[PDB]
mmCIF file of C-alpha atoms in Angstrom:
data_model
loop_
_atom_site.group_PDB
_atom_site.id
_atom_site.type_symbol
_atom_site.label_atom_id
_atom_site.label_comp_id
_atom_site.label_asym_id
_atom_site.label_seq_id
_atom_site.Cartn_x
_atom_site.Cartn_y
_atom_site.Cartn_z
ATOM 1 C CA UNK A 295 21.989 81.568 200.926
ATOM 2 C CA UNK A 296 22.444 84.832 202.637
ATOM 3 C CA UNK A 297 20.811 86.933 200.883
ATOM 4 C CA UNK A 298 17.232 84.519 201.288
ATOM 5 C CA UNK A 299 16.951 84.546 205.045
ATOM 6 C CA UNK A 300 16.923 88.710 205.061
ATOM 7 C CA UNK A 301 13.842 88.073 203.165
ATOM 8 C CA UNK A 302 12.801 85.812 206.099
ATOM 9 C CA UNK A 303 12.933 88.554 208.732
ATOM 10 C CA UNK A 304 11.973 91.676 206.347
ATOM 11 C CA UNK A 305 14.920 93.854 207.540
ATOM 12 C CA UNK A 306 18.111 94.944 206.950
ATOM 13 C CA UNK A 307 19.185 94.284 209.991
ATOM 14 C CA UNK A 308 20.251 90.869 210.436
ATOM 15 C CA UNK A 309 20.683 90.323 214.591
ATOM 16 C CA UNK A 310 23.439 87.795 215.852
ATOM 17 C CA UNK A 311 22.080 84.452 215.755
ATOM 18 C CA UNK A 312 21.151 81.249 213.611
ATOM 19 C CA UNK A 313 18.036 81.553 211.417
ATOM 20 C CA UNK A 314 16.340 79.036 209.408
ATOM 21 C CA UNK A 315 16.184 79.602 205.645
ATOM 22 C CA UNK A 316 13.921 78.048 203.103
ATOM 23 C CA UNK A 317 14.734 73.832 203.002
ATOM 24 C CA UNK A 318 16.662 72.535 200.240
ATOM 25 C CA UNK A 319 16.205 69.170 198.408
ATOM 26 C CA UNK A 320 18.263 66.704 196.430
ATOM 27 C CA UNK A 321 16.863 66.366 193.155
ATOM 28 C CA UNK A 322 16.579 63.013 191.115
ATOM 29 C CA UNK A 323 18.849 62.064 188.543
ATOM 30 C CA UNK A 324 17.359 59.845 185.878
ATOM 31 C CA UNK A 325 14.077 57.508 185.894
ATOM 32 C CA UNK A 326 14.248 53.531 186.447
ATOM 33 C CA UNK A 327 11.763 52.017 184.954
ATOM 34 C CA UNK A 328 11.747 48.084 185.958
ATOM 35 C CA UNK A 334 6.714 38.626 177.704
ATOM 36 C CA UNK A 335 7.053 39.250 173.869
ATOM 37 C CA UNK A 336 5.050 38.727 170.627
ATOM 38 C CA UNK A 337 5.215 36.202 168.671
ATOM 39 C CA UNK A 338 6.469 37.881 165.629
ATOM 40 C CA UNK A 339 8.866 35.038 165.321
ATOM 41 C CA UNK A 340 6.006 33.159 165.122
ATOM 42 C CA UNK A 341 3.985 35.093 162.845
ATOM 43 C CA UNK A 342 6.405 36.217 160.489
ATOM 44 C CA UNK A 343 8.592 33.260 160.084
ATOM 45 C CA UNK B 736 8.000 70.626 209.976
ATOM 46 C CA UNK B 737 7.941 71.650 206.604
ATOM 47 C CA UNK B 738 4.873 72.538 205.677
ATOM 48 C CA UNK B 739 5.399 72.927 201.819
ATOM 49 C CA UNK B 740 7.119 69.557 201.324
ATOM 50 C CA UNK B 741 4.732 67.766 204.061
ATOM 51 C CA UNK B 742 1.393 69.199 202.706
ATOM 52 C CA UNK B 743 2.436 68.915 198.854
ATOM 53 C CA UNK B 744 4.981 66.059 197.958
ATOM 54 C CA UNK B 745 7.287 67.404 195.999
ATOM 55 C CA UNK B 746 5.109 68.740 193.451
ATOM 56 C CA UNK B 747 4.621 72.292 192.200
ATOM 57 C CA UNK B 748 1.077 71.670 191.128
ATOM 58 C CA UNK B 749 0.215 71.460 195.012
ATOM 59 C CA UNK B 750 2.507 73.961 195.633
ATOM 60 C CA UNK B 751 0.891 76.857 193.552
ATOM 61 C CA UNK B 752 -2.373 76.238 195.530
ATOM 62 C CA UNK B 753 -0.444 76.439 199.060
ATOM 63 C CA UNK B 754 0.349 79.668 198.134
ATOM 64 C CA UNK B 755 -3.303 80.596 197.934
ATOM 65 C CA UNK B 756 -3.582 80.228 201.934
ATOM 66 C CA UNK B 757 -0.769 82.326 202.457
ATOM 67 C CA UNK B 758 1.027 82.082 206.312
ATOM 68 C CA UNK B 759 -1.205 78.758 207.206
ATOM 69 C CA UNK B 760 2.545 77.693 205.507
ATOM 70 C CA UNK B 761 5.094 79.651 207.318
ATOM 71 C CA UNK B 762 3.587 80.479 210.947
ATOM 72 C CA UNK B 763 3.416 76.507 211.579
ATOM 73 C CA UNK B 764 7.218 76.539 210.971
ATOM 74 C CA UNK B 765 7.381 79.765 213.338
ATOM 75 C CA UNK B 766 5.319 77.928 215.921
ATOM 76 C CA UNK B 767 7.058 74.951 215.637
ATOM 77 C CA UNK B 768 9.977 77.058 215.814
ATOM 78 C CA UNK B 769 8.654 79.054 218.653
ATOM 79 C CA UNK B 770 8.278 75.874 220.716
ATOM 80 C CA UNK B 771 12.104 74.746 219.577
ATOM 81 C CA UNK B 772 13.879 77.307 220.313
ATOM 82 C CA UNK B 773 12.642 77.232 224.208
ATOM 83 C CA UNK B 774 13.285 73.687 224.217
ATOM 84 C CA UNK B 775 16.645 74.576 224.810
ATOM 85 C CA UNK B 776 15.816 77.088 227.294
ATOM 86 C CA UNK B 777 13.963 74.895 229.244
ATOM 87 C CA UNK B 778 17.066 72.375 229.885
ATOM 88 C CA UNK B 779 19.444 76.060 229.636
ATOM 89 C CA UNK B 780 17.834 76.903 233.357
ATOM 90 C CA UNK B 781 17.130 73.243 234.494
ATOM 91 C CA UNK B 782 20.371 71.828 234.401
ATOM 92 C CA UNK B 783 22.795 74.974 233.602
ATOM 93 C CA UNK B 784 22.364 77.315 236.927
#
């Protein structure tokens, strides 16, 4: 996480301060996904 | 404001194309930036002589 905000300002240099680096995201765990045929009815 | 997420939810298919307008991205985020950071100078001088 250091090394991607020296790519923000180009330099070496790195001047005393706070600088905002690219965002980070939580990322999702698992899909949810949320009548029947009458193959009791067919079949029997 | 981020720009990437904002423009193009989460998606990489948006994303690519972003990339095709190059700064339009990033110097929103500096502007926005630029504007935050004296937001804080601008109650520094106000209230903190």
């Amino acid at each position: 996480p250091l090394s991607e905000t020296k790519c923000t300002l180009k330099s070496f240099t790195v001047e005393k301060g706070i600088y905002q680096t690219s965002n980070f995201r939580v990322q999702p765990t698992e899909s949810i996904v949320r009548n029947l045929c009458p193959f009791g009815e067919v079949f029997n | 404001v981020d720009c990437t997420m904002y423009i193009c939810g989460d998606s990489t298919e948006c994303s690519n194309l972003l990339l095709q307008y190059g700064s339009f991205c990033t110097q929103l985020n500096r502007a926005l930036t630029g504007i935050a950071v004296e937001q804080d100078k601008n109650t520094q001088e106000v209230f903190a002589q």
